[PDB]
């Protein structure tokens, strides 16, 4: 006569859910074969005055029920400003940074601040080197990326971009091209720290929102120096090592840097109608620039299929398409060629765009979101990363975030985040008929959430090689 | 071929249930048709600096759906550091904050700070009126009761409490029993206001945590007049009308209320082994006092059945049992006289303790929560309310808190709140054959939660009559 | 055959003076043309339980004996305790209060509490705007200083501050130099309000008294945080407009504030052996900082002349005498250079201290108070404001306080205060010779006193412009 | 050139005068040979929290530029609801505190509150014993008068006075008679102690007003038993020794005492046409009683001529005008004899009341003050105390409360209160001609003033023989 939660449950397996809340301040795993939440943090009870927690990525650990290790990264400054919650806190804490969390198997806690051992402070993407052995955080206020050491939390490297737009006016300033510079960042504090916590560096007040490639070619988005912006996203790794890419929303291009000898390799260009690279020019040891004639659309994310032969872009706003490399050649990315672009009427007008994948650990199948402003349904598109199709596309709800994938392949769990402000829910799909298994509660705004993987090939469709 | 969770919310009705999350800093609404967090507000957005967001109740709305209006208070100062959450927090708010929330069909809308408005702030229970017309807030650190209007938040009448121990010391200030002062308590401030917000009129320095008793018996409790503490726990209602009963934790008694002619008219006696009645005595037209020759146990949770029959009062630690009173006689409480006490050989620890209730609608069975510390399993027993006997027993997980029943009366929901560190969810058990249905993720550390009433009539099962 | 005392103050003229009580909890208001007090009013009526009637600054009224508006500030907590008077409370208010009150022809009327409407207690020096349509407050125990809207007693701006000591040590964090911070201080809390109210923000728990740098230098000053004290006094303005100083008693320097612009534009050095200025530096937006190579004396009273041509701070007790900058160029104060230093022979001990003026209409004369502990007398000190030097000193009484002048330039209005235990009274002085004509009764520790301005020239030889 | 106010203070001589303030919470005493005031003192600042420092009187001292010491009572409850001033303390203390002071030559020192030591507390008349080895307390809410020893504070004898109405309705209970009944009080605590502090013993909530016979007999006073009241005043002392009187305001009459036997011998029947005396009968050692056939009209100021060959008791009201007993016969009041009545046509209204009188040392003249309701020009009458007729009557201002007298005779010192709300003043008028020489600034709502006496004889013309 009654049904048993536990039913439903029982099928997914063991595995455990990690989401940050954005606005709500916490950060929480459940275990998604009882419906507990194992455990929460709140990061205001460690006296953090604007703990906007962001993006995040878990270690693997061949048993997260008895212990697991992350790193989430929190926002600041006007971030706090940009939704539609009437926040009252007018000058809030400046935000960016880098915590490094350890569940014991009862609880969270909170082993330090990454950016405080560093010194550098970064508020967007975040992802696990595919050895496990460090990290990386992305920014695109300050325009820098770096992989940090996971035992030391210190930097192994740090890159810096910056923009020279042919035509210095906003509405121009990337639809008109011009030259992107790469630049290595080094240390200026003793003992090889950053003097780049909080707010120092930031170039603009908040990172740009969906289609804010718009509101900083208007002239809406105030900073320092918004004419000179790039909006670094993530820095993503092979996952056959050696590279990591770094992503950049304005220009519409990704940057391949070898991670052992820390230079810049190549520079792949976005948007549907220009070659599948742009030049790299060395300047001296420290600088590389590149020319990029026009933008002809903005991109935001960028990953690798889990055997690393295909990396893919996405075109958003402008255009809204996958764009596909064929990256087999491990050893030389200069020659990775553009070999498929995904194409869909389901990419009906401006919106929706597409910020987040995950694919099957056969990487035959990728579940990518479909992000609408309230109120248009947000869902899941389904492609066919064979013949590079959209398959299906469902409705879900308000504000669909990140996807992740149990590591059997059977069940993607999304999180959709109310805009900070209405209604939020993990989602669940099984991948076998692609079909919506329904919703779990869950009161936070998550940008992010990641099943904590259990082995190093695990992290090949976790937060590693895509966001 | 898979199960779907909206199979699980369907059978369980169209039911809004509200939680606050005590360490987490948030309050959160949920669909149970569906599984959506339908909003959730985090205080720290509206520059709130301790949101331990503590007890809460819902006002009925036609249709909770489109919009509903509730109440949820908070705690600060040195509540925050009697957790095993390892907080750094320099110079915490100081709580006791009584917010006024809306939800608008879509958000949660921040409405106001009613310890603003009228200038009593109050930390413990809250309660609706049973004419839905206002609301009655508790707190064991002031020692202060009260009813507040629902349209202006100012105060209707307010108590104060006070101890006079018979011997001047810590061990024995209870035992050796005292003199309770209740006192009208009346504004001093412009406009009818209060100057009692924050921690102004704290006798000691957090609230007592289960077991608590000893601890301030020993000294261990800062603050400056634990002598004189009661700890006043909430102020419930009769659902007939006419009366409110402040519980008094420390000297283990009820006083009852008149609440249009604003006097207390009786004090019921705790402990088994006591009268029904102590003596209450008037000293002028503002001053009661009543002389308790002995405190055998301290008691908590009190209130009554939904049709009024009934009233309960919770011994708890030094006994462990329900007592319980005929209130049948409506029209004069200092007849109502203890007529059933439910024992079990269970209860003769320390713990459980059992701090909170939920009747069904015909008031023939209450669900009751069974408190222990780490790390043995907590639970709900089942007690057959018409002989007054313990049906039955569950074991859950850690801490466990409030317990709603959907107005149907087909299903108990509760909180486990995971001692605001580790595992925490929301349980629904059937109470048909009283079977626990399973669990939901909710990463909050909840004291309490409601399911939005759509009548009067579903108040007598809601924060109004119990806690 | 009789003197009669209206022949005395037939001579004075109409005009209304006010002052508060400090410890009586009063404060009065008083008719010079008869004699009479026209009305006074009791902060205990009104349930303040530390009515410690502060600073007082009046808006001009065309006719002060039909009506006139005021502003009176309090100061509570350790406050109460560091007088001669053995007080007895145990439970002191916070004071901080900042009281709107308005003399309507026959009486007082309190209007509100602009700290509870704006969010910001503030207990130090109040002032009107030279366009009276506005009023500051400074806080030497928060550090804080604040433009009000005199309409709606919201901020229009508040300013922090705060010291970085050079030295970790209280006995050398100030001698031994340091950095100032200047930081916009924001609302965050609904309605664009402060959380500031009473105690909250304190970094020490009483306004240093007289000499009471080599108090906080000795650790004899309690409080979270001492080492960060700068003990900001007043924020004067420049009677020209456009230009707010705040003076900062313990590191010895006057900020210089654009008021429209809200930013800091200079930083005047007090010490005489020092630069005209110290370097400002902007750090972001809403942050400057400025480097104190060391602090050779403290510093306290600060004011313009009433043509703005010069702007003064006195050295206090390490140095005893009158700092003078020419701020003849309105344009910019960055340009204001030091044109003379007032000495003495008589300032070369530890006291007098010299921590209130008023200038006559045409600016060629100032009184200055010269206070010192009991016993010695304390007085006025006439000096000339053209060649400046010391022409006249006159011993009074016990306490010397504030001064104020009747406003065609005749009569020199002052306050005695008893140290609020011993004697007190009115002193009028002409100022064609500069003789006392005598005393009058007033049971009254005044730390103020005005006399209420008719116009907006007024109020540039009022509490406006010096205090 | 200028006009010196000390040529006005150089002809008063060297005079203390001293005054508390009533709504003020003060108490303040100023020297009338230089304008200072001499210390004052706020209760407030000793915990007071209902500081209506209400009557007060002063022991001679060979110099009280040295020392001298008084007593002040105070009022509390209701009393704070009865003037213009919008209070806000809706349960304020409870007053009838008797707080002895010295002036040490510096400062004032609060020695102790006397109704604590004593345990009985009055809240009307304070007047000193013509031997200064005591004084004597009277309260028109309880209905008591006691007198006090000096060194002890304990009281040497008490009486209790009741009312018992011919008709058991307020409106009558007075104009158609009754019996008053004079009652030993003992004291019934341990160490000959009262139980008598604060409100209890209290009939009426407040003390009556001026015309407040008309508002008790309306029912609009509150209280346990106003058909009880008396409405004693104050006790008054024969400046010969012997003798003290009780006046009683409602039934219209005075009962002499013997101090040193502790019985009355008296009673003397105040309004024009009754005859001088009514018979007193003894009922038992302790107990007396006294038929009024009817009250004709309510009484007030009482008091001797200061060689105490006259006695004066004044009809107010329903009659105003001065009785006046022959009390030549030292040895037997039952013989003292009615022998003129003051009165004027002016006295024909309701008002003006007269509550306060001084004579002139020689007995020849008589101040009296003519009180009336805000607007009326309230002022002083001079008596012919030869012929017992009306010299001249002088108009002043606002609310005119009581009169002392230089002991030279020369300068009759007064105080006008605002009604606790608007202009306050001390007045000095010549008696060789009967001029007012001006008004002094007193910002306090004084119902009492005195000039400190050096010696016994002093004391005949100060608060000891009359009010
Ligand atoms: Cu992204
Ligand atoms: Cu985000
Ligand atoms: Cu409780
Ligand atoms: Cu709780
Ligand atoms: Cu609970
Ligand atoms: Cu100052
Ligand atoms: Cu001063
Ligand atoms: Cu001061
Ligand atoms: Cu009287
Ligand atoms: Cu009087
Ligand atoms: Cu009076």
């Not at 006569?1 to 859910?17: E, I, R, T």
């Not at 491990?330 to 553009?338: L, S, V």
Request: glycine share 8%.
């Amino acid at each position: 006569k009654y049904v048993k939660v536990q039913d439903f449950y029982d099928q997914l397996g063991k595995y455990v859910l990690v989401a940050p809340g954005k606005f709500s301040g916490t950060v929480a795993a459940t275990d998604l074969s009882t419906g507990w939440t194992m455990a929460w943090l709140a990061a205001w009870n460690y006296g953090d005055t604007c703990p906007i927690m962001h993006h995040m990525a878990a270690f693997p650990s061949p048993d997260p029920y008895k212990e697991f290790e992350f790193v989430v990264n929190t926002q600041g400054g006007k971030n706090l400003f940009i939704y539609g919650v009437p926040v009252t806190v007018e000058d809030p804490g400046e935000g960016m940074k880098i915590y490094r969390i350890k569940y014991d198997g009862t609880r969270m806690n909170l082993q330090r601040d990454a950016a405080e051992v560093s010194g550098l402070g970064l508020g967007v993407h975040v992802t696990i080197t595919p050895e496990a052995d460090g990290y990386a955080v992305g920014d695109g206020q300050k325009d820098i990326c770096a992989e940090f050491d996971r035992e030391t939390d210190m930097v192994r490297y740090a890159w810096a971009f910056d923009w020279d737009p042919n035509v210095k006016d906003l509405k121009r300033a990337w639809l008109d091209g011009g030259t992107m510079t790469i630049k290595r960042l080094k240390p200026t504090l003793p003992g090889g720290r950053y003097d780049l916590q909080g707010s120092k560096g930031n170039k603009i007040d908040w990172e740009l929102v969906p289609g804010g490639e718009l509101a900083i070619e208007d002239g809406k988005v105030s900073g320092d120096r918004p004419l000179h912006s790039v909006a670094n996203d993530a820095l993503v790794f092979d996952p056959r090592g050696k590279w990591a890419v770094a992503s950049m929303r304005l220009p519409g291009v990704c940057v391949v840097f070898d991670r052992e000898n820390q230079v810049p390799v190549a520079v792949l260009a976005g948007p549907k109608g220009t070659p599948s690279q742009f030049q790299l020019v060395k300047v001296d040891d420290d600088t590389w620039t590149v020319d990029i004639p026009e933008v002809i659309s903005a991109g935001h994310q960028a990953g690798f299929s889990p055997d690393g032969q295909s990396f893919l872009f996405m075109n958003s706003l402008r255009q809204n398409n996958i764009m596909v490399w064929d990256s087999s050649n491990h050893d030389d990315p200069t020659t990775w060629e553009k070999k498929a672009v995904v194409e869909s009427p389901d990419w009906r007008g401006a919106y929706p765009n597409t910020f987040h994948m995950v694919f099957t650990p056969d990487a035959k199948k990728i579940y990518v979101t479909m992000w609408w402003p309230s109120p248009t349904p947000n869902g899941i598109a389904v492609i066919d990363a064979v013949n590079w199709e959209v398959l299906k596309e469902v409705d879900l709800g308000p504000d669909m975030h990140t996807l992740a994938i149990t590591y059997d392949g059977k069940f993607v769990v999304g999180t959709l985040s109310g805009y900070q402000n209405t209604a939020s829910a993990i989602v669940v799909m099984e991948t076998e008929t692609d079909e919506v298994l329904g919703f779990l509660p869950s009161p936070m705004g998550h940008h992010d959430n990641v099943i904590v993987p259990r082995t190093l090939e695990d992290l090949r469709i976790s937060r590693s090689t895509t966001t």
